[PDB]
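A common beginner's mistake is to predict each chain separately and then try to dock the pieces by hand. The better habit, illustrated here, is to supply every component at once so that their relative placement is modeled jointly.
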Amino acid sequence: PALTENGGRVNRVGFTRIQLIGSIKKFFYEWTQEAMDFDTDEELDS
Amino acid sequence: KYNAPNTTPSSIGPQIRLDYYYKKALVDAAKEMYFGQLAEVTNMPKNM
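With all components supplied together, the output reads:
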């Protein structure tokens, strides 16, 4: 970027900006009372 | 899930204890005694 004693419109410059994009997206089990009761392991639920 | 009887395997897996064991057992009362009561006893000495 040069210059001179006279000056004037000599060195014009610009700027930009960028963009970003994201997203948010996204399970069960069942059991019977007879299963828990008549089981040998009484800590099965845990 | 389900707990079908061991022959039809349970959903969770194998089952070990299928029975509850009642500790107390059943005995038979001794037959009441009749002829033994009526008796006389004579002592037979040894070396005789």
